[PDB]
Amino acid sequence: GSMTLSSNQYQLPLNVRPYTTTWCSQSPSCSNLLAIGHDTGITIYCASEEQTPGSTGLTLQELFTIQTGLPTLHLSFSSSCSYSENSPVYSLFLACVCQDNTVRLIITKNETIITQHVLGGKSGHHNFVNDIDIADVYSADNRLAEQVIASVGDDCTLIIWRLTDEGPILAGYPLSSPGISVQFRPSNPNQLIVGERNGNIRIFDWTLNLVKNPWLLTLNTLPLVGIASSLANVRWIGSDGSGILAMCKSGAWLRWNLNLLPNVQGISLFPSLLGACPHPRYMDYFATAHSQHGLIQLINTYEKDSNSIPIQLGMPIVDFCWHQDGSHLAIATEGSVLLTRLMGFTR
Numbered sequence: 001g002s003m004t005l006s007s008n009q010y011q012l013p014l015n016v017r018p019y020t021t022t023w024c025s026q027s028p029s030c031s032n033l034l035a036i037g038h039d040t041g042i043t044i045y046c047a048s049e050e051q052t053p054g055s056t057g058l059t060l061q062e063l064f065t066i067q068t069g070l071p072t073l074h075l076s077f078s079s080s081c082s083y084s085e086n087s088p089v090y091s092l093f094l095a096c097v098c099q100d101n102t103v104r105l106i107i108t109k110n111e112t113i114i115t116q117h118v119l120g121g122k123s124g125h126h127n128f129v130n131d132i133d134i135a136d137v138y139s140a141d142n143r144l145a146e147q148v149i150a151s152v153g154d155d156c157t158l159i160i161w162r163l164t165d166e167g168p169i170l171a172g173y174p175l176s177s178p179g180i181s182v183q184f185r186p187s188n189p190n191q192l193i194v195g196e197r198n199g200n201i202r203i204f205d206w207t208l209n210l211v212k213n214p215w216l217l218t219l220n221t222l223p224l225v226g227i228a229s230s231l232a233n234v235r236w237i238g239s240d241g242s243g244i245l246a247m248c249k250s251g252a253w254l255r256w257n258l259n260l261l262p263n264v265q266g267i268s269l270f271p272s273l274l275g276a277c278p279h280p281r282y283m284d285y286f287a288t289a290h291s292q293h294g295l296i297q298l299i300n301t302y303e304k305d306s307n308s309i310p311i312q313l314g315m316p317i318v319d320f321c322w323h324q325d326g327s328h329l330a331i332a333t334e335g336s337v338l339l340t341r342l343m344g345f346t347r
Contacts, residue, residue, distance in 0.1 A: 001306070001307055001308050001309065002309065002310065003298070003308060003309075003310035003342055003343070003344055004342075004343040004344065005310055005311075005340055005341055005342050005343055006057050006340070006341050006343075007338050007339065007340040007341075008057070008058075008059060008060065008338065008339050009336050009337070009338045009339075010045075010060050010062075010336060010337050010338075010339075011335065011336055012036070012038070012043075012335055012336055012337065014335070015039075016038050016039060016040070016043075017038060017039045017071075017334065018036050018037070018038045018318050018319070018332040018333075018334070018337070019037050019038060019039075019071055019072060019073050019074075019318065019319070020035075020036070020037040020072065020073060020074055020075050020318075020319050020332075021034065021035070021036055021037075021318075021319045021320060021321050021330050021331070021332045021337070022034075022035050022075050022076060022077060022321050023035075023077075023321055023322070023323050023324060023330065024077040024081055024092075025077070025280065025323075025324040026076075026077050026078055026079040026081070027077060027078070027079050027080065027081040027082065029081070029082055029083050030077070030081040030082065030083055030090070030092075031323075031324045032046055032047045032048060033045070033046055033047075033063075033077075033081070033090070034046075034047060034060065034330050034337075035075055035077065035094070036332060036337060037071070037072030037073065037074070037075045037096065038071070038072065039070070039071045040065075040067065040068065040069060040070070040071075041065050041066045041067045041068040041069070041072060042065065042066040042068065042072050042075065042094065042096070042106075043062060043064075043065045043066075044062075044063045044064055044065070044066070044090070044092070044111075045060045045061060045062050045063060045337075046060070046061045046063055047059070047060055047061075047323070047328070047339065048061065056346075057339075057341045058323075058328060058339055058341065059339070060337070060339050063090070063110070064110050064111040065111055066092075066094075066106065066108060066111050066113060067111070067113075068098060068106075070098050070099045070100060071098065071099040072096050072097070072098055072099075073096075073097045073098065073099065073129070074096060074097040074129070074130075074131055074132045075094060075095070075096045075097075075132075076094070076095045076096070076132055076133050076134050077092070077093070077094055077095075077134075078093040078094070078095065078134045078135075078136055078147060079135075079136045080093040080136060080144065080147070081093055089109050089110055090108070090109075090110055091107075091108065091109060092106075092107070092108040093105065093106075093107055093108075093134075093147070094106045094107075094108070095132050095133070095134035095149050096132065097129045097131075097132050097151065100120065101120065101124065101125055101127070101128060101129055101153075102118050102119060102120040102124060103118075103119040103120075103124055103125070103129060103132060103149060103151045103159065103161065104116060104117060104118050104119065105117045105134070105147065105149060105163065117163065117168075119149075119151075119159070119161055119170075123170060124159070125151065125153035125154075125155050125157065125159065126153075126155040127153050127154035127155040127178075128153055128154045129151055129152070129153045129154075130152055130153055130154065130178065130179060130180045130181070131151065131152050131179070131180065131181045131182050131233075132149065132150070132151045132182065133149070133150050133151075133182050133183050133184050133192070134147060134148065134149050134150075134184075135147075135148045135150075135184040135189035136148075136189065137189050137190075145164070145165060146162050146163060146164045146165075147162075147163045148160065148161070148162045148163075148184075148189065148206075149161040149162075149163075150182045150184065150192055150206075151179075151182065152175070152178075152179025152180065152181065152182045152194055153178065153179055154178040154179075155178075156174065156175045156176070156177060156178055156179065157172050157173060157174055157175060157179065158172070158173040158174075158175060158179055158182065158194055158202075158204070159171070159172050159173075160172075160173070160206050171206070171210065172210070173204070173210065173214055174212060175194065175196050175200075175202070176196060176198060176200055177196045177197045177198035177200065178196065178197040179194055179195070179196060179197075180195050180196065180197050180231060180232070180233065181193075181194065181195035181232075181233035181234050181235070181275065182194050182195075183234075183235055183236055185236050185241035186236055186238065186239055186240060186241045187239065187240045187241060188240075188241060190205050190206065190207045191203065191204065191205045191206075191216075191241075192204050192206065193234055193235075193236055193244065194234075195231050195232075195233050195234035195246065196231065197226070197230065197231055198222065198230060198231070199220050199221035199222035199225075199229070199230035199231050199248075200218055200219075200220055200222075201218060201219040201220065201221070201231075201234050201244070201246060202215045202217075202218055203215060203216045203217040203218070203219070204216060219244070219246075219256065221246050221248060221252075221254055224254060224261065224262065224265065225248055225250070225252045225254075225265075227249045227250075227271070227273075228249065228250075229248060229250065230248045230249070231246065231247075231248050231249070232247045232248055232249045232272050232273065232274065232275030232276070233246075233247055233274070233275025233276060234246040234247070234275075235275075235276060235278050236278075237255070237278050237283045237286075238283045241258075242257065242258050242283075243255060243256060243257050243258060243283060244256045244258070245276055245278055245286060245301075246276075247268075247272050247275045247276035247288065248272070249271055249272060249273060250267070250271055250272075251267050251268030251269070251270055251271050251272045251288065252265070252266075252267045252268075253265065253266055253267070253268065253272075253276060253286075253288075253299075255301050264301055264302070266299070266301070266304060268288045268297055268299060269290075269295075269297050269307060269309070270288070270289070270290035270293070270295060270297060271290065272288045272289065272290075272291075273289075273291045273292070274288075274289055274291055274319065274320075275288070276288050277320060277321060277322060279322060279326055280322050280323075280324050280325075280326050281326040282326065284300050284301050284302050284303075285298060285299070285300055285301075286298075286299055286301070287299075287320065287322070287329070289311075289317050289320060290317075291316060291317045291318075292316050293316070294311070294312060294313035294314055294315045294316055294317050294333070295309060295311060295312050295313075295317075296309070296310060296311035296317070296320065296329070296331070297309050298310050298342075310340075310342055311329075311331070311340065313331075313333065313338075315333050315334065316333065316334060317331055317332070317333060318332040318333060318334060319331075319332045320332065325347060326345050326347065327341050327342055327343075327345040327346050327347045328340065328341050328342075329342070
């Protein structure tokens with residue numbers, strides 16, 4: 001089944017290859033900002049309402065480009081991003097992964113990198129970094145105590161990198177196979193979830209008091225089901241992280257709510273190289289792409305036979321993400337970015 005929608009497409013400069021897309025949802029004032037990581041940096045767009053009469057849909061305006069000089073492969077905005085008028089200035093805080101296998105915190109005034117912290121050499125990952133996330137930690141004082149960056153790689157380690165009122169604190173934790181996803185728990189920056197290539201799913205409170213088994217809980221997709229039987233990503237679902245959604249590269253997906261099996265399982269119409277993209281408002285929904293062919297399936301976890309395919313492009317999809325409003329998707333192709341509004345989520 002198809003879906004009613006409208007899409008605008010914006011050409012990227014002919015020499016610009018995109019790698020990653022993310023909305024600045026973590027910060028309320030900046031939630032209309034879209035970042036595209038590409039081969040020489042990060043380009044920031046602002047989504048706003050169209051000016052020509054009779055268009056409730058959003059348009060995209062390119063703002064500026066943060067120069068890095070090399071590919072940016074993964075990217076996450078922090079909750080400290082802010083905007084102020086009076087010459088308007090965006091103050092951005094971005095965690096990212098670059099082609100040199102560094103994990104970074106990039107702090108900006110519009111395009112200008114005022115401060116940059118770079119984790120590389122011997123302190124950082126010793127192989128490809130596959131994913132990154134960032135969380136802001138506030139103490140009993142209610143001020144910003146720490147910014148915490150988590151990253152996982154093919155060196156089979158999880159790195160926790162805290163930038164404190166004391167300076168940096170670095171910690172590495174061993175995994176049983178390459179770390180392919182990491183995400184802090186919504187509403188609980190003390191906890192995170194790690195997906196491993198082999199199907200292991202680590203839940204971790206990094207603040208408790210290194211060992212071989214620091215996890216609170218390890219789930220596992222392997223008995224319930226590079227491209228194989230597992231695993232593309234795993235994500236928290238719900239405002240409080242009351243659920244977990246895991247997606248294998250085959251398209252097999254699993255959901256747990258928080259006899260010892262998952263609450264529900266299924267399989268996407270297509271393989272899922274990038275993994276699942278959970279809906280930001282309706283926890284029963286997630287999107288998954290056939291990235292090489294340019295298809296996106298929208299799956300409702302409690303309604304099987306709902307073969308909903310809102311998107312077919314006839315060209316590969318590089319990455320995609322939901323806008324916080326839950327109606328728009330941003331989709332990067334090899335030479336463009338699309339802004340797509342699904343009318344059924346309207347709103």
